[PDB]
Structures are given as structure tokens and as C-alpha cells.
């Protein structure tokens, strides 16, 4: 099973998450493992 | 003041006639036209519906100068189901239309903002594969 | 063995390839298939606004380290 973000190419999902502030990012990182990986990747450069 | 047109062919086969200035907001289409001399431009990964959307977006942003807030027209234009939004992201990326990609991705981002993890899960139908310990763990930055 | 190139696949998407200047364009397309699942017969590579021919090589188009190719798709 997949979701909206995990179905995107990595760069585009990361790009989507890059519009979120640290707090929103942290909230996003708790939804699932994959989202956690992408969100934490975006936490670098912040 | 009236420009020539080129043709775009969606993956289903429909051909769209588009003003060249409007169409060339897509860098992809621009290079397939100018450098590869393809007209109609084959778009095997964009269906007719999405292509209609892309063309009306570009047509609407035809005379754009050049801050981060999303214009209301674009907002309403993006009041669509998640599937359409998804395919719009894919198409905007492949077609290399920076503005459309930006506004659509920011729209999705706005669907994430100001929510609890479970609310985000409800929004994007995310399956939880976290255990209680991982949840407790992810709590920490 | 051992040159590195880029293939732009969209506004924000790209493919990273490790190649040799003696690799043919068809080898490049093959690697592209191996990494993305796009059949070579649907791939058009462009470098400096010119079509890359399957039979030719990276060297003939003067493609070197950190050069960026452009991938564009056609009907099967």
C-alpha cells in the first residue's frame, strides 16, 4: 500500500515537504516511517 | 499581436492547439519544438484532462511579470481531488513549468500544515507502520 | 568506469549515471531503463539542443564529467 507522498518521485515529495516549517515537518515525521525519513531529510538545511 | 500555434498530443491521442508563447512556458515542450522539431509534441505521460488543466493554467499566467502567497485564482484552480493534484505535480515537473509545480506542491504542503499526525493520516490516507515506541521516539526531534 | 553524468528528467528530477566516454547512447538509455524502467525506444536524450544518436558515443558529442543530458519521452 502507498500514499500521495510515497508515490511521488523523491525529489518532488521532498520539495513538497520543504514548504513546511520545522513544527509542521515534525508533525509530518510521525505519520509513518517513509514520511519520517523524508521529513528528517528536510530538517537538515534548517 | 496574434501569435502562431503549435500542437500538443496527450497520451490518449487528443491534440490541443496552443499559442506558441503560452506553450513554451513548458521548457520541455519548448525544446521538443525548437530542437527536435516535433509538432505535434508527443506527451505519452500526460493525459487529456491534465493537459487541459496545464494549458488553462499557462494561458492564465500568460502575462506574468518576473511574492509567495498563492493567488486566489490558482487556489480555486487547485480545488480538485488529490488524484488530479498528484498528476498535476507529475506533469508540471516533466513539462518543466516551474510556477505550476511550485504552486501545486505548496498546495499539498498547505494540506499538511497545522495538523496532528493522525489528522495528516486521515488527509492523505497514510497507513501507520509506527509502533508505540517509535511514536514515542519520533516525538523527540 | 569512471565518469559521472546527469540526466534531467523534469524541473526537479534527475538521474545520476556512472559511465565511460566510450559508452554508446544506447548504453546510456539502457542504464536509464535499469534505474527507471523506461524502455530505451521511448527515450530521447538531448545535449546542447541536439538529439543524441543510439549508435554514437558520449565522446562524439563531447560529453564529459558533470555534463547534463536531458531526457524526453515519446510514444512506444
- Partners of B36 on chain C (C-beta within 8 Å) are 44, 46, 51, 72
Q: How far apart are CA B86 and CA B78, in angstroms?
A: 11
The three cell numbers of residue B136 are 514515542
Q: Are C19 and C69 in contact (CB under 8 A)?
A: no
Q: Specify the residue for cell string 490516507.
A: B125
Cα–Cα nearest to C10, from C51, C70, C67: C70
Residues near B132 by beta carbon (within 8 Å), at least 6 away in sequence = none
Q: Give per-residue burial for B27-66: e unless 16+ CB within 10 Å, then b.
A: bbbbbbbeebebeebbbebbebebbebbbebbeebeeeee
Would you call the peptide bond into B40 cis, given omega within 30 degrees of 0 as the criterion? yes
Inter-chain touch C49–B34, beta carbons under 8 Å:
yes
- Partners of A27 on chain B (C-beta within 8 Å) are 112, 115-117, 120
Q: How far apart are CA A4 and CA A23, in angstroms?
A: 21
Q: Are B99 and A4 in contact (CB under 8 A)?
A: no
**Displacement of CA B111 from its chain's centroid (Å):** 15
Task: Please return the burial class of A27, using the count of CB atoms within 10 Å of its CB with bins 0-12, 13-18 and 19+.
Answer: buried
Answer positive or negative: Cα dihedral of A12, A18, A20, A24.
Answer: positive
Domains contained in chain B, CATH given: 1-141 (3.30.710.10)
Inter-chain touch B97–C50, beta carbons under 8 Å:
no
Q: Is B69 left (phi over 0), alpha (psi -120 to 50) or beta?
A: beta
Domain ranges of chain C: 1-76
The three cell numbers of residue C61 are 558529442
Radius of gyration of chain C (CA): 11
Q: Specify the residue for cell string 502507498.
A: A2
Would you call the peptide bond into C2 cis, given omega within 30 degrees of 0 as the criterion? yes
CA C70 to chain B, closest CA, distance in angstroms equals 9
Residue B97, chain C, CB below 8 Å: the answer is yes
Q: Specify the residue for cell string 509567495.
A: B68
What resolution, expressed in A, was reported for this entry?
A: 2.5
The three cell numbers of residue B35 are 530542437
User: What architecture is domain A1-46?
Assistant: Up-down Bundle (1.20)
Q: Are B5 and B19 in contact (CB under 8 A)?
A: yes
Residues near C3 by beta carbon (within 8 Å), at least 6 away in sequence = C18, C19, C20, C21, C58, C64, C65
Inter-chain touch C11–B44, beta carbons under 8 Å:
no
Residues near A15 by beta carbon (within 8 Å), at least 6 away in sequence = B101, B105, C12
Amino acid at each position: 500500500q502507498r500514499d500521495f507522498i510515497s508515490l511521488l518521485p523523491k525529489e518532488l515529495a521532498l520539495y513538497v515537504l520543504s514548504f513546511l516549517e520545522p513544527k509542521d515537518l515534525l508533525q509530518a515525521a510521525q505519520t509513518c516511517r517513509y514520511w519520517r525519513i523524508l521529513a528528517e531529510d528536510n530538517l537538515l538545511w534548517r | 499581436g496574434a501569435m502562431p500555434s503549435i500542437k500538443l498530443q496527450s497520451s490518449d491521442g487528443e491534440i490541443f492547439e496552443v499559442d506558441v508563447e503560452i506553450a513554451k512556458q513548458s521548457v520541455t515542450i519548448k525544446t521538443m519544438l525548437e530542437d527536435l522539431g516535433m509538432d505535434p509534441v508527443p506527451l505519452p505521460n500526460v493525459n487529456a484532462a491534465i493537459l487541459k488543466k496545464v494549458i488553462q493554467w499557462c494561458t492564465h499566467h500568460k502575462d506574468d511579470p518576473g511574492t509567495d502567497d498563492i493567488p486566489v485564482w490558482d487556489q480555486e484552480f487547485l480545488k480538485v481531488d488529490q488524484g488530479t493534484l498528484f498528476e498535476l505535480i507529475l506533469a508540471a515537473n516533466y513539462l518543466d513549468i516551474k510556477g505550476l509545480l511550485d504552486v501545486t506542491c505548496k498546495t499539498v504542503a498547505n494540506m499538511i500544515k497545522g495538523k496532528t499526525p493522525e489528522e495528516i493520516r486521515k488527509t492523505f490516507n497514510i497507513k501507520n507502520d509506527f509502533t508505540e515506541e517509535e511514536e514515542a521516539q519520533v516525538r523527540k526531534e | 568506469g569512471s565518469m559521472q553524468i546527469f540526466v534531467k528528467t523534469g524541473a526537479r528530477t534527475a538521474i545520476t549515471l556512472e559511465v565511460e566516454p566510450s559508452d554508446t547512447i544506447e548504453n546510456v538509455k539502457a542504464k536509464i531503463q535499469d534505474k527507471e524502467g523506461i524502455p530505451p525506444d521511448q527515450q530521447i536524450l538531448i545535449f546542447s539542443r541536439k538529439l543524441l544518436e543510439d549508435g554514437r558515443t558520449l565522446s562524439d558529442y563531447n560529453i564529459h564529467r558533470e555534463s547534463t543530458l536531458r531526457l524526453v519521452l515519446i510514444f512506444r
